[PDB]
Design a protein around this ligand. Sequence first.
Ligand SMILES: Cc1c2c(c(O)c3c(O)cccc13)C(=O)[C@]1(O)C(=O)C(C(N)=O)=C(O)[C@@H](N(C)C)[C@@H]1C2
Ligand SMILES: Cc1c2c(c(O)c3c(O)cccc13)C(=O)[C@]1(O)C(=O)C(C(N)=O)=C(O)[C@@H](N(C)C)[C@@H]1C2
Ligand SMILES: [Mg+2]
Ligand SMILES: [Mg+2]
Lengths: 197, 197
Amino acid sequence: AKLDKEQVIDNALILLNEVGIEGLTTRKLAQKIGVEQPTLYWHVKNKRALLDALAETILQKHHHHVLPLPNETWQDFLRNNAKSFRQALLMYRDGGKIHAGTRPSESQFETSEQQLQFLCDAGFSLSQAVYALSSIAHFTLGSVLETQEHQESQKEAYPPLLTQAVAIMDSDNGDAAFLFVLDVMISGLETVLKSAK
Amino acid sequence: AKLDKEQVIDNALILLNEVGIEGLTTRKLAQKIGVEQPTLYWHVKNKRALLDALAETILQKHHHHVLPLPNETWQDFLRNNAKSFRQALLMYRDGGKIHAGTRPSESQFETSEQQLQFLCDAGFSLSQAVYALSSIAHFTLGSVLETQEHQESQKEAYPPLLTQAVAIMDSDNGDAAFLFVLDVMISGLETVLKSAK
Ligand SMILES: Cc1c2c(c(O)c3c(O)cccc13)C(=O)[C@]1(O)C(=O)C(C(N)=O)=C(O)[C@@H](N(C)C)[C@@H]1C2
Ligand SMILES: Cc1c2c(c(O)c3c(O)cccc13)C(=O)[C@]1(O)C(=O)C(C(N)=O)=C(O)[C@@H](N(C)C)[C@@H]1C2
Ligand SMILES: [Mg+2]
Ligand SMILES: [Mg+2]
């Protein structure tokens, strides 16, 4: 035979970069792979399945700060977790739209479970931990979808502050903005814990 | 003749809901409107132009907390601005993907300019103001793209904390998560100002 699932997914990651999330189809993956539709069907049963597969495997491949390191404060962890998640979303074309709307995978259960436990052990109620992890994902993803969709935008007279505001944001493709509000999020949450009185 | 730009855009808003951002095309707008391509062309010259038009007009129509109200702290403003932006993104199918990657419009220059001035007058450096407005948009947009792409996901065994974490997030389609981390953002920034010593 031929097809192991990781080869299929690797071809799918190449295709995503070549044609983007919209033009990525099951039928096109089968072209690139050199195979019939119903042999692909056993690995990836529809487009949704395929996209969920990319979402996961992109994180398996490039999202390595999944867990607090022995020397880390929950502050450190959150920072380095979020940075790692963002570079991982930036790695692929439409990486932000690939992730959006997924839920963590079986391959991510033990670490994601751990991320929440780690936050509960830090002082946070569950809700709080859930909302903080969730929302740092949303923040990061929003940051990445915007900068990705922006530089893909080939369109063809701001006021003073707005001119600088947009200059500042086109400069680093959103880096400093990201790091700053990650930092205010983490101080925000610090104040949540200080709300033990 | 027939076509004023607002009728075209109104038809485009109906279509977006009917077919979504991917299936929305210039050629399809012309169908719905009852008109030839090159007569549409004068209002909306390509797909990008069209999408930028939706992005703006959706905010013109549904994003009404553009400015601090006489009785508002910058805290109040940011909160109510962000809430207003999010409900505005939720109003349309793919509203989050319609906004992503745009830059504020001519119709938004005087208010957006004002939002930054207002923040500078509050104590924030420009950078800070730019990063806070930018990033609250990113946060809100990420929050909305995720919940929208999620409920559109018709796919067909979590651990304990993860089971609750996801239950909590499917409950309110992300509301409480949003309000909580908006609140920690705004406390985060409060600490930025306390960093005048
Ligand atoms: C806790 C949680 C997370 C995620 C998530 O999508 C999610 C959800 O959809 C419902 C309830 C909880 C969560 C993440 O996407 C994820 O990005 C993720 O899978 C993840 C990962 N695989 O390690 C992370 O590290 C997290 N980090 C970016 C905050 C975050 C954790
Ligand atoms: C300041 C700013 C903003 C936005 C933005 O896209 C942006 C940018 O792309 C580069 C530099 C600055 C900004 C907004 O989208 C917008 O959503 C917006 O247009 C906007 C609006 N039209 O009133 C807002 O109220 C803002 N709020 C959600 C923080 C935010 C303001
Ligand atoms: Mg996720
Ligand atoms: Mg914007």
